[PDB]
């Protein structure tokens, strides 16, 4: 139909998506979401819909989680990051349901990544691989693992949650997570174990 | 494996629950119609209801959901299929069935209706099906529509739905190299009439549609006609097209590469591993192009070439899984471009060596040793090329064996050893015709103009009996001059608006020789039109058939075989 | 290419024209499982006739290519070079980077199993000869020698 109708449909769908991402999906209806998806994939405006979804997701991420992580980089940094990741995943469940109904035809025709993969990629680009968040996360994980190795006990399930989050963020396998975590972790061991062996060869014997 | 007995018991109990409305908790509200159903069945069948209930939203918890933009009958049939697995698909509601299947994202019904539409594609709904496949992403349907639309529409180019097509779809159709047109001007006028459907809604697409057609018609007429239909004082289109046709150098299409060729079936397999193969002779290229094997080496079949230049195969037998052969009533259609046989609607009775004759768009298979073998074993049946179905016709009054049939003056003329009967399609009746004075069988006849030329008969001989439809009499013309002490294999065919003969002769202690002659209609004499050299054509056999048709040398490949 | 690659010591092989030797060495049909045997063959072809074919020595040096050029040839040539030769060092040093170092063909002598009189899919062929790869886990085929005669014996 006319451009005004599809523009209004897209505007209301964007408003609904933003309301869902504000953890207000319970108040929103899926009868409204299915009908909006119907009227959205009706005029075959998948390209515009995909671009708008990407813009909305990246704007929401940069506005909310990029500010939240930087604001709490010292007060439960990893806990806040895990909570943000869980919120992103639980919103992207429904977001991926609707835009995966869209994705069937869209990625079977345009040959692109799915909306779940798109959200994972944009989250990786805008949060984990940030110019400041990445180094801070690396430094804090190295510090806590070194403190755990020193002898004192720290939280361990949190590290497992972070490693699982990075593995899922890889989205293809162990390409990014091996590079962002394993490589610095291997470098930390390359020095700690060398120093430990140097101390042990002089402070004890072969017994 | 999963116990099928318990599976069917569970399914029938769930369907009983659905009919009796015991454990229904969610009701679908569609245009005021109540649809009490369950969540488990909907989740298992559709991929939208699994995202409708497992979401955590308002309607997810609401025991009442107002499903909009759907149809009551389509929803009912989808629900009953989800509850019992029976999908009753008619010829009309498949469009809305596909619409609702795509809306609800149900893979099983989507695949079923995709198969039904891939079977239902025909001439009168080709453009509509292509538009439907463009609206909803379906690559298989899109490709089949591409091929069939290209061929049939470039043959017809008169569909009303062709005007209402998207710009991208038309760009794909016109710029494709699979169009079947005897000339490059019919596509030009089709594009012109599509453009003139509107005036300003097509101006922006005018610069793009001309970019896909060759410049051989982009400087000739149908440029001032567009100026006549140009919007007033528009100086951005006239001068644009004036200096625009520099690129797009003229390249010949593929539709102008059809030549009158003799299609041969069941030829002697060059490779001894194969049983029988199919080849073709080129009267102009003087070569032998190979043809695709019959479907599942279908032997003892019949050929027909419609006035629309379409090849069909009916009847035949397949070796049952030493002599072993079982007769099957399968039907197939030959793709002139893909070099493959597309299956079609099978017949009702199996046939051996059927006589396929086309008339009024119907394919007539007369006789052919039917397994029925009843009081009226002489039962003949026509085929509908529009509805894709077979319909019985008036039976042949006399039972005949090893017969041939042709079509003249919109009537079916079947010939036997000495008798002839003409079938009237308008009245569905048989009328007695003239009686031949010679008892000959195992021969073929070619319909040239308003005359029937029964050539040969019994090996065969050089006896020729010419029959006139307007005169209703059998008269002799001459005998073909052939080498004595030989067994010629005569084949009557029409080519180059003349009656030629494909006669292969074999001498004593000598190999078979291939040569064709041109019979002079007024002089009653067979003149040497062309001699087939043995360096290109090898032995074909005895039970091979020949027919008149057009094929593309580009799509086909030359058969590699030693002279 | 089949036998000299296993002998490479024939007396008649020493007396060969440059073009024929270049065609032999540059060809990718050398039946050699190692790349040093051709190097030493070229060397011994250039040790019995030295200071006479120095330009052809450089040509064969380039022909044998870097894979065998980087092993010992420099030191042996230094031992055997004529005095007061400077530009020859410059031209010899250049044959380290260029000229498309590629793997040979004789290195692909995989130990396999040759089979005869197999079940032929074609009805024309009564039997067929095929092969199996113990390491590559693949099944290769061979052309029948007479294409019509069977009941043959094999020897390796």
mmCIF file of C-alpha atoms in Angstrom, chain B residues 232-544:
data_model
loop_
_atom_site.group_PDB
_atom_site.id
_atom_site.type_symbol
_atom_site.label_atom_id
_atom_site.label_comp_id
_atom_site.label_asym_id
_atom_site.label_seq_id
_atom_site.Cartn_x
_atom_site.Cartn_y
_atom_site.Cartn_z
ATOM 1 C CA UNK B 232 4.200 16.752 -21.475
ATOM 2 C CA UNK B 233 7.335 18.958 -21.443
ATOM 3 C CA UNK B 234 9.398 16.067 -20.007
ATOM 4 C CA UNK B 235 12.937 16.729 -21.275
ATOM 5 C CA UNK B 236 14.632 14.147 -19.027
ATOM 6 C CA UNK B 237 13.478 11.086 -21.018
ATOM 7 C CA UNK B 238 13.576 11.988 -24.727
ATOM 8 C CA UNK B 239 17.148 13.284 -24.745
ATOM 9 C CA UNK B 240 17.985 10.537 -22.237
ATOM 10 C CA UNK B 241 16.981 7.700 -24.558
ATOM 11 C CA UNK B 242 18.419 9.632 -27.505
ATOM 12 C CA UNK B 243 22.002 9.179 -26.267
ATOM 13 C CA UNK B 244 21.478 6.113 -24.049
ATOM 14 C CA UNK B 245 21.543 3.158 -26.456
ATOM 15 C CA UNK B 246 25.343 3.027 -26.742
ATOM 16 C CA UNK B 247 25.859 -0.099 -24.546
ATOM 17 C CA UNK B 248 23.975 -3.423 -24.589
ATOM 18 C CA UNK B 249 25.400 -4.711 -27.878
ATOM 19 C CA UNK B 250 22.879 -6.831 -29.781
ATOM 20 C CA UNK B 251 23.130 -10.478 -28.713
ATOM 21 C CA UNK B 252 20.855 -13.137 -30.258
ATOM 22 C CA UNK B 253 18.513 -14.827 -27.800
ATOM 23 C CA UNK B 254 17.907 -18.566 -27.360
ATOM 24 C CA UNK B 255 14.301 -18.754 -28.586
ATOM 25 C CA UNK B 256 15.334 -18.133 -32.206
ATOM 26 C CA UNK B 257 17.341 -21.391 -32.222
ATOM 27 C CA UNK B 258 14.532 -23.854 -33.004
ATOM 28 C CA UNK B 259 14.964 -25.954 -36.146
ATOM 29 C CA UNK B 260 12.764 -28.551 -37.814
ATOM 30 C CA UNK B 261 14.325 -31.816 -36.633
ATOM 31 C CA UNK B 262 13.430 -35.511 -36.696
ATOM 32 C CA UNK B 263 13.153 -36.858 -33.148
ATOM 33 C CA UNK B 264 13.957 -40.565 -32.819
ATOM 34 C CA UNK B 265 13.119 -42.793 -29.853
ATOM 35 C CA UNK B 266 14.169 -46.308 -28.823
ATOM 36 C CA UNK B 267 17.239 -46.190 -31.061
ATOM 37 C CA UNK B 268 19.947 -48.844 -30.924
ATOM 38 C CA UNK B 269 22.003 -48.083 -27.791
ATOM 39 C CA UNK B 270 25.538 -47.099 -28.944
ATOM 40 C CA UNK B 271 26.820 -48.221 -25.491
ATOM 41 C CA UNK B 272 26.030 -51.975 -25.079
ATOM 42 C CA UNK B 273 25.350 -51.488 -21.311
ATOM 43 C CA UNK B 274 22.182 -49.476 -22.183
ATOM 44 C CA UNK B 275 19.146 -51.242 -23.772
ATOM 45 C CA UNK B 276 17.646 -48.536 -26.067
ATOM 46 C CA UNK B 277 18.563 -44.847 -26.451
ATOM 47 C CA UNK B 278 17.040 -41.762 -28.072
ATOM 48 C CA UNK B 279 18.754 -39.705 -30.779
ATOM 49 C CA UNK B 280 17.778 -36.977 -33.233
ATOM 50 C CA UNK B 281 18.753 -36.082 -36.795
ATOM 51 C CA UNK B 282 19.399 -32.529 -37.974
ATOM 52 C CA UNK B 283 18.110 -31.941 -41.535
ATOM 53 C CA UNK B 284 19.959 -28.591 -41.584
ATOM 54 C CA UNK B 285 22.979 -29.054 -39.303
ATOM 55 C CA UNK B 286 23.622 -32.543 -40.768
ATOM 56 C CA UNK B 287 24.544 -33.931 -37.338
ATOM 57 C CA UNK B 288 23.073 -36.326 -34.767
ATOM 58 C CA UNK B 289 22.356 -34.725 -31.387
ATOM 59 C CA UNK B 290 21.751 -37.032 -28.440
ATOM 60 C CA UNK B 291 18.504 -37.004 -26.470
ATOM 61 C CA UNK B 292 17.709 -37.840 -22.864
ATOM 62 C CA UNK B 293 16.813 -41.450 -22.145
ATOM 63 C CA UNK B 294 13.118 -42.295 -21.765
ATOM 64 C CA UNK B 295 11.909 -42.202 -18.147
ATOM 65 C CA UNK B 296 13.090 -45.432 -16.493
ATOM 66 C CA UNK B 297 13.951 -46.763 -19.976
ATOM 67 C CA UNK B 298 10.292 -46.636 -20.987
ATOM 68 C CA UNK B 299 10.052 -48.848 -24.078
ATOM 69 C CA UNK B 300 7.118 -49.422 -26.445
ATOM 70 C CA UNK B 301 5.811 -45.866 -26.141
ATOM 71 C CA UNK B 302 4.207 -43.318 -28.448
ATOM 72 C CA UNK B 303 5.100 -39.763 -29.386
ATOM 73 C CA UNK B 304 3.079 -36.694 -30.326
ATOM 74 C CA UNK B 305 4.023 -33.116 -31.194
ATOM 75 C CA UNK B 306 1.301 -30.536 -30.624
ATOM 76 C CA UNK B 307 0.973 -27.474 -32.882
ATOM 77 C CA UNK B 308 2.511 -25.611 -29.924
ATOM 78 C CA UNK B 309 5.631 -27.797 -30.421
ATOM 79 C CA UNK B 310 5.376 -29.890 -27.256
ATOM 80 C CA UNK B 311 6.559 -33.491 -26.875
ATOM 81 C CA UNK B 312 4.664 -36.036 -24.772
ATOM 82 C CA UNK B 313 5.129 -39.702 -23.874
ATOM 83 C CA UNK B 314 2.286 -42.047 -22.908
ATOM 84 C CA UNK B 315 1.998 -45.736 -22.146
ATOM 85 C CA UNK B 316 4.953 -48.082 -22.349
ATOM 86 C CA UNK B 317 6.375 -50.887 -20.248
ATOM 87 C CA UNK B 318 9.238 -51.106 -17.757
ATOM 88 C CA UNK B 319 11.287 -54.260 -17.012
ATOM 89 C CA UNK B 320 9.899 -55.691 -13.789
ATOM 90 C CA UNK B 321 12.357 -56.182 -10.933
ATOM 91 C CA UNK B 322 15.658 -63.704 -19.458
ATOM 92 C CA UNK B 323 12.426 -61.857 -20.274
ATOM 93 C CA UNK B 324 10.778 -59.547 -17.737
ATOM 94 C CA UNK B 325 8.560 -56.568 -18.583
ATOM 95 C CA UNK B 326 5.569 -54.967 -16.856
ATOM 96 C CA UNK B 327 3.297 -52.384 -18.472
ATOM 97 C CA UNK B 328 2.724 -49.048 -16.715
ATOM 98 C CA UNK B 329 0.306 -46.236 -17.588
ATOM 99 C CA UNK B 330 2.749 -43.482 -16.592
ATOM 100 C CA UNK B 331 2.726 -40.213 -18.541
ATOM 101 C CA UNK B 332 5.612 -37.799 -19.057
ATOM 102 C CA UNK B 333 6.337 -34.443 -20.686
ATOM 103 C CA UNK B 334 9.637 -33.460 -22.296
ATOM 104 C CA UNK B 335 11.350 -30.198 -21.352
ATOM 105 C CA UNK B 336 12.690 -28.558 -24.507
ATOM 106 C CA UNK B 337 15.383 -26.685 -22.538
ATOM 107 C CA UNK B 338 16.236 -28.676 -19.399
ATOM 108 C CA UNK B 339 16.699 -31.886 -21.456
ATOM 109 C CA UNK B 340 14.648 -33.943 -19.002
ATOM 110 C CA UNK B 341 11.256 -35.649 -18.861
ATOM 111 C CA UNK B 342 8.868 -34.061 -16.351
ATOM 112 C CA UNK B 343 6.280 -36.531 -15.008
ATOM 113 C CA UNK B 344 2.613 -35.728 -15.525
ATOM 114 C CA UNK B 345 -0.781 -37.202 -14.644
ATOM 115 C CA UNK B 346 -0.749 -40.947 -15.446
ATOM 116 C CA UNK B 347 -3.434 -42.573 -17.558
ATOM 117 C CA UNK B 348 -6.190 -44.915 -16.383
ATOM 118 C CA UNK B 349 -5.139 -48.017 -18.353
ATOM 119 C CA UNK B 350 -1.693 -49.225 -19.387
ATOM 120 C CA UNK B 351 -0.786 -49.272 -23.078
ATOM 121 C CA UNK B 352 1.784 -50.867 -25.378
ATOM 122 C CA UNK B 353 2.785 -48.804 -28.438
ATOM 123 C CA UNK B 354 0.016 -46.177 -28.180
ATOM 124 C CA UNK B 355 -0.913 -43.791 -30.981
ATOM 125 C CA UNK B 356 -0.665 -40.293 -29.507
ATOM 126 C CA UNK B 357 -2.515 -37.703 -31.613
ATOM 127 C CA UNK B 358 -3.139 -34.058 -30.695
ATOM 128 C CA UNK B 359 -6.340 -32.238 -31.643
ATOM 129 C CA UNK B 360 -8.079 -29.163 -30.186
ATOM 130 C CA UNK B 361 -5.460 -29.118 -27.436
ATOM 131 C CA UNK B 362 -6.344 -32.676 -26.373
ATOM 132 C CA UNK B 363 -3.922 -35.603 -26.551
ATOM 133 C CA UNK B 364 -5.648 -38.677 -27.992
ATOM 134 C CA UNK B 365 -4.204 -42.148 -27.341
ATOM 135 C CA UNK B 366 -6.049 -44.649 -29.540
ATOM 136 C CA UNK B 367 -5.652 -48.317 -28.649
ATOM 137 C CA UNK B 368 -2.299 -49.719 -27.617
ATOM 138 C CA UNK B 369 -2.936 -53.255 -26.309
ATOM 139 C CA UNK B 370 -4.767 -52.287 -23.082
ATOM 140 C CA UNK B 371 -4.665 -54.766 -20.127
ATOM 141 C CA UNK B 372 -8.471 -54.310 -19.763
ATOM 142 C CA UNK B 373 -9.142 -56.623 -22.748
ATOM 143 C CA UNK B 374 -12.948 -56.419 -22.290
ATOM 144 C CA UNK B 375 -15.871 -56.445 -24.794
ATOM 145 C CA UNK B 376 -14.919 -52.842 -25.758
ATOM 146 C CA UNK B 377 -11.096 -53.206 -25.474
ATOM 147 C CA UNK B 378 -11.046 -50.649 -28.357
ATOM 148 C CA UNK B 379 -11.634 -47.905 -25.744
ATOM 149 C CA UNK B 380 -9.732 -44.647 -26.523
ATOM 150 C CA UNK B 381 -9.175 -41.752 -24.054
ATOM 151 C CA UNK B 382 -8.195 -38.096 -24.437
ATOM 152 C CA UNK B 383 -6.063 -35.920 -22.164
ATOM 153 C CA UNK B 384 -6.844 -32.408 -20.925
ATOM 154 C CA UNK B 385 -3.848 -30.084 -21.198
ATOM 155 C CA UNK B 386 -5.791 -27.404 -19.286
ATOM 156 C CA UNK B 387 -7.130 -29.343 -16.281
ATOM 157 C CA UNK B 388 -4.347 -31.988 -16.351
ATOM 158 C CA UNK B 389 -6.713 -34.956 -16.437
ATOM 159 C CA UNK B 390 -7.860 -37.762 -18.726
ATOM 160 C CA UNK B 391 -11.370 -38.195 -20.121
ATOM 161 C CA UNK B 392 -12.820 -41.179 -21.968
ATOM 162 C CA UNK B 393 -14.193 -40.697 -25.482
ATOM 163 C CA UNK B 394 -16.455 -42.679 -27.805
ATOM 164 C CA UNK B 395 -14.980 -46.180 -28.265
ATOM 165 C CA UNK B 396 -13.679 -47.353 -31.613
ATOM 166 C CA UNK B 397 -16.376 -49.585 -33.177
ATOM 167 C CA UNK B 398 -13.850 -52.208 -34.350
ATOM 168 C CA UNK B 399 -10.916 -53.671 -32.429
ATOM 169 C CA UNK B 400 -7.663 -53.094 -34.323
ATOM 170 C CA UNK B 401 -4.050 -54.097 -33.702
ATOM 171 C CA UNK B 402 -0.848 -52.416 -34.925
ATOM 172 C CA UNK B 403 -2.682 -49.302 -36.104
ATOM 173 C CA UNK B 404 -1.735 -45.687 -36.782
ATOM 174 C CA UNK B 405 -3.673 -42.455 -36.362
ATOM 175 C CA UNK B 406 -3.376 -38.884 -37.649
ATOM 176 C CA UNK B 407 -5.362 -35.652 -37.298
ATOM 177 C CA UNK B 408 -6.833 -33.863 -40.331
ATOM 178 C CA UNK B 409 -9.514 -31.143 -40.471
ATOM 179 C CA UNK B 410 -9.969 -31.131 -36.679
ATOM 180 C CA UNK B 411 -10.804 -34.851 -36.746
ATOM 181 C CA UNK B 412 -9.074 -38.060 -35.672
ATOM 182 C CA UNK B 413 -8.279 -40.502 -38.495
ATOM 183 C CA UNK B 414 -7.135 -43.929 -37.270
ATOM 184 C CA UNK B 415 -5.977 -46.433 -39.894
ATOM 185 C CA UNK B 416 -5.767 -50.231 -39.765
ATOM 186 C CA UNK B 417 -4.991 -53.075 -42.190
ATOM 187 C CA UNK B 418 -7.924 -52.276 -44.491
ATOM 188 C CA UNK B 419 -10.520 -50.208 -42.570
ATOM 189 C CA UNK B 420 -10.680 -46.566 -41.514
ATOM 190 C CA UNK B 421 -12.930 -44.689 -39.089
ATOM 191 C CA UNK B 422 -13.095 -40.933 -38.525
ATOM 192 C CA UNK B 423 -13.875 -39.601 -35.047
ATOM 193 C CA UNK B 424 -15.843 -36.375 -34.654
ATOM 194 C CA UNK B 425 -14.745 -34.523 -31.487
ATOM 195 C CA UNK B 426 -17.761 -32.197 -31.682
ATOM 196 C CA UNK B 427 -20.328 -35.026 -31.632
ATOM 197 C CA UNK B 428 -18.214 -37.854 -30.116
ATOM 198 C CA UNK B 429 -19.106 -40.350 -32.839
ATOM 199 C CA UNK B 430 -17.398 -42.560 -35.419
ATOM 200 C CA UNK B 431 -18.241 -42.541 -39.135
ATOM 201 C CA UNK B 432 -17.316 -45.212 -41.671
ATOM 202 C CA UNK B 433 -14.722 -44.126 -44.238
ATOM 203 C CA UNK B 434 -13.321 -45.482 -47.499
ATOM 204 C CA UNK B 435 -11.958 -49.025 -47.721
ATOM 205 C CA UNK B 436 -8.439 -49.795 -48.913
ATOM 206 C CA UNK B 437 -7.911 -52.426 -51.603
ATOM 207 C CA UNK B 438 -4.645 -53.759 -50.115
ATOM 208 C CA UNK B 439 -4.097 -55.531 -46.789
ATOM 209 C CA UNK B 440 -1.027 -53.884 -45.250
ATOM 210 C CA UNK B 441 -0.019 -53.362 -41.618
ATOM 211 C CA UNK B 442 2.960 -52.229 -39.515
ATOM 212 C CA UNK B 443 3.138 -48.877 -41.312
ATOM 213 C CA UNK B 444 3.011 -45.176 -40.470
ATOM 214 C CA UNK B 445 1.075 -42.262 -41.939
ATOM 215 C CA UNK B 446 1.808 -38.535 -42.087
ATOM 216 C CA UNK B 447 -0.872 -35.840 -42.292
ATOM 217 C CA UNK B 448 0.209 -33.214 -44.842
ATOM 218 C CA UNK B 449 -2.424 -30.591 -45.572
ATOM 219 C CA UNK B 450 -5.843 -32.146 -46.171
ATOM 220 C CA UNK B 451 -4.545 -35.542 -47.328
ATOM 221 C CA UNK B 452 -3.504 -38.762 -45.593
ATOM 222 C CA UNK B 453 -0.460 -40.592 -46.982
ATOM 223 C CA UNK B 454 -0.333 -44.216 -45.809
ATOM 224 C CA UNK B 455 3.250 -45.175 -46.687
ATOM 225 C CA UNK B 456 4.452 -48.768 -46.635
ATOM 226 C CA UNK B 457 2.892 -51.758 -44.942
ATOM 227 C CA UNK B 458 2.990 -55.545 -44.797
ATOM 228 C CA UNK B 459 9.226 -56.264 -43.901
ATOM 229 C CA UNK B 460 7.494 -53.237 -45.399
ATOM 230 C CA UNK B 461 7.360 -52.250 -49.078
ATOM 231 C CA UNK B 462 7.162 -49.169 -51.304
ATOM 232 C CA UNK B 463 3.367 -49.245 -51.679
ATOM 233 C CA UNK B 464 1.739 -45.822 -51.307
ATOM 234 C CA UNK B 465 -2.016 -45.243 -50.974
ATOM 235 C CA UNK B 466 -3.044 -41.577 -50.884
ATOM 236 C CA UNK B 467 -6.380 -40.692 -49.278
ATOM 237 C CA UNK B 468 -8.244 -37.403 -49.725
ATOM 238 C CA UNK B 469 -10.521 -36.132 -46.964
ATOM 239 C CA UNK B 470 -12.578 -33.946 -49.309
ATOM 240 C CA UNK B 471 -12.902 -36.746 -51.889
ATOM 241 C CA UNK B 472 -13.119 -39.733 -49.488
ATOM 242 C CA UNK B 473 -11.253 -42.197 -51.693
ATOM 243 C CA UNK B 474 -8.024 -44.197 -51.634
ATOM 244 C CA UNK B 475 -5.857 -43.838 -54.742
ATOM 245 C CA UNK B 476 -2.387 -45.022 -55.707
ATOM 246 C CA UNK B 477 0.315 -42.576 -56.779
ATOM 247 C CA UNK B 478 3.561 -44.508 -57.390
ATOM 248 C CA UNK B 479 6.127 -46.801 -55.780
ATOM 249 C CA UNK B 480 9.334 -45.503 -54.213
ATOM 250 C CA UNK B 481 12.387 -46.459 -56.321
ATOM 251 C CA UNK B 482 14.577 -48.510 -53.977
ATOM 252 C CA UNK B 483 17.295 -51.112 -54.409
ATOM 253 C CA UNK B 484 15.993 -54.598 -55.146
ATOM 254 C CA UNK B 485 16.438 -57.527 -52.744
ATOM 255 C CA UNK B 486 16.310 -55.132 -49.783
ATOM 256 C CA UNK B 487 14.043 -54.419 -46.801
ATOM 257 C CA UNK B 488 13.500 -50.643 -46.577
ATOM 258 C CA UNK B 489 12.217 -49.158 -43.318
ATOM 259 C CA UNK B 490 9.835 -46.389 -44.368
ATOM 260 C CA UNK B 491 8.965 -43.458 -42.096
ATOM 261 C CA UNK B 492 6.395 -40.881 -43.209
ATOM 262 C CA UNK B 493 6.839 -37.351 -41.861
ATOM 263 C CA UNK B 494 6.085 -33.731 -42.792
ATOM 264 C CA UNK B 495 8.999 -31.298 -42.990
ATOM 265 C CA UNK B 496 9.673 -27.959 -44.708
ATOM 266 C CA UNK B 497 6.024 -27.763 -45.830
ATOM 267 C CA UNK B 498 6.553 -30.918 -47.889
ATOM 268 C CA UNK B 499 6.044 -34.669 -47.546
ATOM 269 C CA UNK B 500 9.439 -36.329 -47.097
ATOM 270 C CA UNK B 501 10.231 -39.930 -46.192
ATOM 271 C CA UNK B 502 12.873 -41.355 -43.843
ATOM 272 C CA UNK B 503 13.632 -44.720 -45.464
ATOM 273 C CA UNK B 504 16.509 -46.861 -44.189
ATOM 274 C CA UNK B 505 17.422 -49.737 -46.507
ATOM 275 C CA UNK B 506 19.620 -52.780 -45.943
ATOM 276 C CA UNK B 507 21.165 -54.912 -48.679
ATOM 277 C CA UNK B 508 22.283 -58.532 -48.545
ATOM 278 C CA UNK B 509 25.496 -58.925 -46.514
ATOM 279 C CA UNK B 510 25.600 -55.119 -46.235
ATOM 280 C CA UNK B 511 25.038 -52.565 -43.494
ATOM 281 C CA UNK B 512 21.994 -50.307 -43.258
ATOM 282 C CA UNK B 513 22.025 -47.162 -45.399
ATOM 283 C CA UNK B 514 20.256 -43.935 -44.423
ATOM 284 C CA UNK B 515 18.694 -41.701 -47.076
ATOM 285 C CA UNK B 516 15.652 -39.430 -47.258
ATOM 286 C CA UNK B 517 13.584 -38.510 -50.311
ATOM 287 C CA UNK B 518 11.264 -35.618 -51.148
ATOM 288 C CA UNK B 519 7.967 -36.751 -52.663
ATOM 289 C CA UNK B 520 6.646 -34.413 -55.351
ATOM 290 C CA UNK B 521 2.959 -33.903 -54.579
ATOM 291 C CA UNK B 522 1.995 -32.747 -58.078
ATOM 292 C CA UNK B 523 4.458 -34.921 -60.030
ATOM 293 C CA UNK B 524 3.863 -38.068 -57.911
ATOM 294 C CA UNK B 525 7.581 -38.793 -57.657
ATOM 295 C CA UNK B 526 10.089 -39.152 -54.818
ATOM 296 C CA UNK B 527 13.051 -36.841 -55.438
ATOM 297 C CA UNK B 528 16.398 -37.158 -53.661
ATOM 298 C CA UNK B 529 16.338 -34.279 -51.180
ATOM 299 C CA UNK B 530 19.380 -35.264 -49.108
ATOM 300 C CA UNK B 531 21.560 -38.335 -48.567
ATOM 301 C CA UNK B 532 22.422 -39.112 -44.944
ATOM 302 C CA UNK B 533 26.111 -39.977 -44.706
ATOM 303 C CA UNK B 534 26.964 -42.902 -42.436
ATOM 304 C CA UNK B 535 29.854 -40.928 -40.909
ATOM 305 C CA UNK B 536 27.404 -39.145 -38.577
ATOM 306 C CA UNK B 537 24.396 -41.484 -38.242
ATOM 307 C CA UNK B 538 24.789 -45.102 -37.136
ATOM 308 C CA UNK B 539 22.269 -47.943 -36.916
ATOM 309 C CA UNK B 540 19.037 -47.200 -35.046
ATOM 310 C CA UNK B 541 17.222 -50.557 -35.095
ATOM 311 C CA UNK B 542 13.760 -51.608 -36.245
ATOM 312 C CA UNK B 543 11.250 -50.596 -33.543
ATOM 313 C CA UNK B 544 12.289 -46.921 -33.609
#
